[PDB]
């Protein structure tokens, strides 16, 4: 029921008197909770929307030099003072080169040459800063019970479902109560302030590649750093690190810009988690929250409904779904309406004793049609056994 098919699915059994249960709301995991008087509800924190991520100091990812020139003075003939050397848009490097009688100077010695060029960053990766009031974790809850095989993955429609529904928990709204129809109301007490280190990380974007890099790694990137939202002439903080003015043996200081650092940024982005960006709300699909499951409002729906009449036909007979739980897919052939599936899993058929606990406890057929497809779930002991679906 959207949580039993998870390979990292967590089975929750037993709470603190049914009032508060402490759970780990993982960004990639889903936890199925089974209670004494409540159905098994799978909660999966699948959505993670980061909204209003303000820009940070973003280094240049591929720069390039402009029209460069050199100002040369002789040895003891003054230092180089370029006219573009006083221009902030042109990066320049001064050096002591050889100037001689054959080199044009009036004395053989070390003249001064300064080479300048309009070093402009052709593209820069920009790291958005995520505030703590921008996170919103979307957790889908789904009561395991009266649903078919096409509702385990068929998540199209959560408000009009009444068996599954998604609730968004934010830092402003940590406490919530999702009214699951028939089952009562599941109480979410997730701590959005206690997040998975949202203030220690930045969301760097480069080539449409969202990456939740660390704050120290984002503040340690050695690129030409545009400061803020100044989208015009960038400041280029550490802009001199992209070019190298290699002086020759004579008066030729060739300023060569470095290559594209997006490959080295991908090489440094291996240890970070790649995040998605859905516009203003960046979609981070990983994390780990801490949820207070309120099972006081959670009731067992259809408990007063009687057992089904007959014609429980196990179509698509299931097996262990990677955890020992046996997903029973049945077709209730009968017009009992709100009937209850009287199924049992036991080895000894001459005794008829209960053999194992059921995942989808209280299996109740909901449809009033002739053949109603439903999915049940049971967890028997280690080995194989007999599954009697119905009486006779």
């Amino acid at each position, epitope marked *: 029921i959207r949580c039993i098919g998870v390979s990292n699915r967590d089975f929750v059994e037993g709470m603190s008197g049914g009032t508060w249960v402490d759970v780990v709301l993982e960004h990639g995991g889903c936890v199925t909770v089974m209670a004494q008087d409540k159905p098994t509800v799978d909660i999966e924190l699948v959505t993670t929307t980061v909204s209003n991520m303000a820009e940070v100091r973003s280094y*240049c990812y591929e*720069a390039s030099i402009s029209d460069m020139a050199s100002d040369s003075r002789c040895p003891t003939q003054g230092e180089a003072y370029l006219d573009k050397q006083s221009d902030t848009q042109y990066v320049c490097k001064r050096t002591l080169v050889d100037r001689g009688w054959g080199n044009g100077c009036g004395l053989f010695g070390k003249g001064s040459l300064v080479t300048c060029a309009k*070093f*402009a*960053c*052709s593209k*820069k990766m*920009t790291g958005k800063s995520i505030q703590p009031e921008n996170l919103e974790y979307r957790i889908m809850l789904s009561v395991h019970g009266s649903q078919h095989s096409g509702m385990i993955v068929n998540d199209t429609g959560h408000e009009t479902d009444e068996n599954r529904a998604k609730v968004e928990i934010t830092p402003n709204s940590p406490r919530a109560e999702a009214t699951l129809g028939g089952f009562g109301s599941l109480g979410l007490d997730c701590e959005p302030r206690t997040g998975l280190d949202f203030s220690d990380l930045y969301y760097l974007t480069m080539n449409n590649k969202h990456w939740l890099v660390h704050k120290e790694w984002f503040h340690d990137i050695p690129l030409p750093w545009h400061a803020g939202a100044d989208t015009g002439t*960038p400041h280029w903080n550490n802009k001199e690190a992209l070019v190298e003015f290699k002086d020759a043996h004579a008066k030729r200081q060739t300023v060569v810009v470095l290559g594209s650092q997006e490959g080295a940024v991908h090489t440094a982005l291996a240890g970070a988690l790649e995040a998605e960006m859905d516009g203003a709300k960046g979609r981070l699909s990983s994390g780990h929250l801490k949820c207070r499951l309120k099972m006081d409002k959670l009731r067992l729906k259809g408990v007063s409904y009687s057992l089904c009449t007959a014609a429980f036909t196990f179509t698509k007979i299931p097996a262990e779904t990677l955890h020992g739980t046996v997903t029973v897919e049945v077709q209730y052939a009968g017009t009992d309406g709100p009937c209850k599936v009287p199924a049992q899993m036991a080895v000894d058929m001459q005794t008829l004793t209960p053999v194992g606990r059921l995942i989808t406890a209280n299996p109740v057929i909901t449809e009033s049609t002739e053949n109603s497809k439903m999915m049940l779930e049971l967890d028997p002991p280690f080995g194989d056994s007999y599954i009697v679906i119905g009486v006779g």
Partner: antibody, heavy 123, light 110 residues
């Protein structure tokens, strides 16, 4: 790959306000190297830039189209807008919504082009 | 005054190198480096050349840019029928304060 697709009402009335929407694939308006520029490309004339919005939403445009052009941006939708109120025959042209040059590019650098939504302004 | 004088007629032999000259001014073409937009009949212009020398990623090696004064030069060495299109120069004007595209280059690889 980042792609831009300009679309909208290609036929407009005189004195009307044309609205072209540039949808973006492979990126968003809040990117680290994004500045979505709309350029008017009339038939028989070269491309002339009319509005260039930034990641913050506001931007600078041409002064000839300053009295009629607007550069809207959809932050939640990841789309750009080129609006022309009180249009005429001279305002009808190709309206591509390319993503502009990077950070140190104080001059323009139209590396990526939009879908090229042609505009017709007739009564 | 936002006009770039470009050669509007472009032909191309099989493997022939074509030359397109986009003439600007000292304020825009002489002021900075101008790129080109190569457009199809149903497509808008895509970037070829940046700063008048640095070709974009994915651009062909036969496309070669050059800058001399206010004149940008686009050479197409080994030009084919796929080199045909609308190659129009473009540059930002220091006096204009905005980017202006040129007159175009109707390349026709016959």
């Amino acid at each position: 790959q980042v792609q831009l697709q300009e679309s909208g009402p290609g036929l407009v009335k005189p004195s009307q306000t044309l609205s072209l929407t540039c949808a973006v694939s492979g990126g968003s308006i809040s990117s680290g190297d994004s500045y979505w520029s709309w350029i008017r490309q009339h038939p028989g004339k070269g491309l002339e830039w009319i509005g260039s919005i930034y990641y913050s939403g506001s931007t600078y445009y041409n002064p000839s189209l300053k009295s009629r052009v607007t550069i809207p941006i959809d932050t939640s939708k990841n789309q750009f807008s080129l609006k022309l109120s009180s249009v005429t025959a001279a305002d009808t042209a190709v309206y591509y919504c390319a993503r502009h040059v990077g950070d140190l590019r104080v001059n323009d650098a139209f590396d990526i082009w939009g879908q090229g939504t042609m505009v017709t302004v007739s009564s | 005054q936002s006009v770039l004088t470009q050669p509007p007629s472009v032909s191309a032999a099989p493997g022939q190198k074509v030359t397109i000259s986009c003439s600007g001014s000292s304020s825009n073409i002489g002021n900075n480096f101008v790129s080109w937009y190569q457009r199809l009949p149903g497509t808008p212009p895509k970037l070829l050349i940046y700063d008048s020398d640095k070709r974009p990623s994915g651009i062909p090696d036969r496309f070669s840019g050059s800058k001399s004064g206010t004149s940008a030069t686009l050479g197409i060495t080994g030009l084919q029928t796929g080199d045909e299109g609308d190659y129009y120069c473009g540059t930002w004007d220091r006096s204009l304060s905005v980017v202006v595209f040129g007159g175009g280059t109707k390349l026709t690889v016959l």
